[PDB]
């Protein structure tokens, strides 16, 4: 494979299909303090049409995390009557991205027309960075989907209570706070809430994992919620506080469109329902840069040296090990990203005044000698097969004398 480092994941559907399919890829490297770093991302989705293979190939083009957060594929080769409009690649922040596909519609180009039936097997995501390394993620579906093409009617519960408060959802995560219109006293408790997000041919249902609390605490009494769909790693839940109710359903997807409604049904035969409009914010909730630890290395002489330890303690004596380094806030993509090392690779050509070699135990030692009189930051990223990728912020600062 073109991939030099791949890791796999398992995706299973909880509840009924809400109308979209969601998969999260957290480990792709998004280099910090680099407003010029980009990435080439293709996606291949593997189906089975009649027990026979069929691949759909999609290209999202070049990613610009500093400017754009939502992407649609530029081209589709497996083909569909309109494959590109049914896909979305969204950045979630902190180096994480989510790929979304609209179920209940056929993205595959070839149909006998006797097989309306089609099942999703796995998803391959290809990630090429500035250094040219090919990162891949393989998302195996625990149970084959067998998706059915349909047009669900859009209904409106036109008896609920409109709220001035608006629900905003950012990086697929909805957040909203509502007041309480509940006659029963807090001590009565036995309060249950059910949420439904309707709009643009997809419905989302969220419920209590543990059911009704039956105990109200003036202090907040939290509660986990499960939402129909492919659940995100981010826990989804809410809280009702004696006086207000806050909810965070995680799988909320942009395919709902604008002006979609969130319905909140609550009880405790007296029952109530509150509806609220939802809007999809276009700004990333936090920096897309991957988390990076900062280390201070002091040099009293122009030569300086840092040691890159083994990555994340995983795959000691790995088959593939890759170490990258570049200067903070680079301006030119054609020269600033040449400092790349591998076990087989020797001294890189375009790397200037930086040297590195793999000592026994793979302690990669970098000689950054060449700098002087200026506090400069070197961004070092190391990876290995089946070993999460770490990036180090190494600050080189001049020291007046030895032995302090």
């Amino acid at each position, epitope marked *: 494979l073109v991939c030099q480092y791949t890791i796999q994941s398992l995706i299973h559907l909880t509840g009924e299909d809400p109308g979209f399919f969601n998969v999260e890829i957290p480990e792709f490297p998004f280099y910090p303090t680099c407003n010029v770093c980009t990435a080439d991302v293709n996606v291949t989705i593997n189906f089975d049409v009649g027990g026979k293979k069929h691949q759909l190939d999609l290209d999202f083009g070049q990613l610009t995390p500093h400017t754009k957060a939502v992407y649609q594929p530029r081209g589709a080769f497996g083909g569909s009557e309109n494959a590109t409009n049914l896909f979305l690649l969204e950045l979630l922040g902190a180096g994480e991205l989510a790929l979304t596909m609209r179920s209940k519609k056929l993205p595959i180009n070839v149909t006998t027309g006797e097989e309306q039936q089609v099942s999703l097997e796995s998803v391959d995501v290809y990630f090429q960075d500035v250094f040219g390394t090919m990162w891949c993620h393989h998302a195996e579906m625990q149970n084959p989907v067998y998706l059915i093409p*349909e047009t669900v009617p859009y*209904i409106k519960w036109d*008896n609920c209570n409109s709220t001035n408060i608006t629900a905003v959802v950012r990086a697929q995560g909805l957040d909203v706070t509502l007041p309480l219109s509940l006659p029963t006293s807090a001590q009565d408790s036995n309060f249950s809430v059910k949420t439904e997000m309707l709009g643009n041919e997809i419905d989302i249902e969220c419920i209590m994992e543990d059911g009704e609390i039956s105990q109200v605490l003036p202090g907040d009494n939290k509660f986990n919620i499960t939402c129909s769909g492919y659940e995100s790693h981010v826990p989804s839940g809410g809280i009702l506080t004696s006086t207000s109710l806050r909810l965070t359903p995680r799988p909320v997807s942009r395919f709902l469109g604008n002006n979609s409604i969130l319905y909140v049904f609550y009880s405790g035969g007296g029952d*109530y329902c509150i509806q609220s409009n939802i809007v999809f914010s276009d700004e990333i909730p936090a920096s897309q840069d991957m988390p990076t630890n900062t280390t201070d290395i002091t040099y009293v002489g122009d030569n300086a040296t840092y040691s890159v330890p083994m990555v994340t303690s995983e795959d000691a004596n790995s088959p593939n090990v890759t170490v990258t380094a570049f200067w903070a806030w680079p301006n030119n993509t054609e020269t600033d990203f040449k400092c790349k090392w591998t076990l087989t690779s020797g001294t890189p050509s375009g790397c200037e005044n930086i040297s590195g070699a793999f000592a026994s135990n793979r302690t990669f030692d970098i000689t950054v000698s060449g700098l002087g009189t200026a506090p400069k930051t070197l961004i070092i990223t190391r990876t290995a097969t089946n070993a999460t990728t770490t990036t180090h912020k190494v600050i080189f600062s001049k020291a007046p004398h030895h032995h302090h």
Partner: antibody, heavy 120, light 112 residues
Framework: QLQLQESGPGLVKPSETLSLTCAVS????????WSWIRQPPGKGPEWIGF????????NYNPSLKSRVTLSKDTSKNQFSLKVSSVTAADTAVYYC?????????????WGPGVLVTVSS | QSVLTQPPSVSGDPGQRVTISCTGS?????????VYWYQQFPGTAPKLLIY???KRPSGVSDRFSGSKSGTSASLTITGLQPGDEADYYC???????????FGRGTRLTVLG
């Protein structure tokens, strides 16, 4: 063997309020959705609206939203209907039917239906 | 009262097959929304005949089948029997009306 039985007055004066009740036996209101369909003689069925069996949720035909109210009593295992400002266009056989699934709109089990006539 | 277009009545020889056509628009049936068929003997509640375009409830005979291709659906009766004389109504949801639509209806008559 879930059965639906409609009840209510057979004659209502114009501009008054029509009111019926559907009694469900052999099954539970909870877990399903419940709808009202009317059919004037010689014409086809017309959908009115449905009520959620587990929430307060109601959906109405926009052509009748102004004058129609749907309610349910989980106790007594029944749900009701009310039509306001009834006219000669409102005389029909009224059917109460179960809507088994919320995503899709079909009615598997119906009641026998009760005729209501609107006349002075 | 907007309606889906149906033939008022269709005729058929016993033991043959006849077709009943339900025609809609891009708002209801052309949009891909599901089509439903109901059978109604005189003086009785409609009986769900075909649900989900072509699916058959447990009990309905295999002689009944459904089709949806295009902006119009179709209900087929094969091995036509005298007991099939009834009223047949199609149903589909309309996105432009936000309501469930029913057809004009069709009277099935057995010839000979």
């Amino acid at each position: 063997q879930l059965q639906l039985q409609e009840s209510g007055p057979g004659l209502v004066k114009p501009s008054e309020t029509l009111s019926l009740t559907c009694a469900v036996s052999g099954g539970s209101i909870s877990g399903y959705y419940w709808s009202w369909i009317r059919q004037p003689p010689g014409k086809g069925p017309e959908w009115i609206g449905f009520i959620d069996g587990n929430t307060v949720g109601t959906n109405y035909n926009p052509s009748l939203k102004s004058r129609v109210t749907l309610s349910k009593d989980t106790s007594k295992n029944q749900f009701s209907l009310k039509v306001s400002s009834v006219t000669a266009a409102d005389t029909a056989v009224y059917y109460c039917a179960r809507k088994p699934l919320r995503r899709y709109f079909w009615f598997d089990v119906w009641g026998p239906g009760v005729l209501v006539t609107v006349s002075s | 009262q907007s309606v889906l277009t149906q033939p008022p009545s269709v005729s058929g020889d016993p033991g043959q097959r006849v077709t009943i056509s339900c025609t809609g628009s891009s708002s209801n049936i052309g949009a891909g929304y599901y089509v439903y068929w109901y059978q109604q003997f005189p003086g009785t509640a409609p009986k769900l005949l075909i649900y989900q375009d072509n699916k058959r409830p447990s009990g309905v005979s295999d002689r009944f089948s459904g089709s949806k291709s295009g902006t119009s659906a179709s209900l087929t009766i094969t091995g036509l029997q005298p007991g099939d004389e009834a009223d047949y109504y199609c149903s589909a949801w309309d996105s432009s009306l936000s309501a469930v639509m029913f057809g004009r209806g069709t009277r099935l008559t057995v010839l000979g």
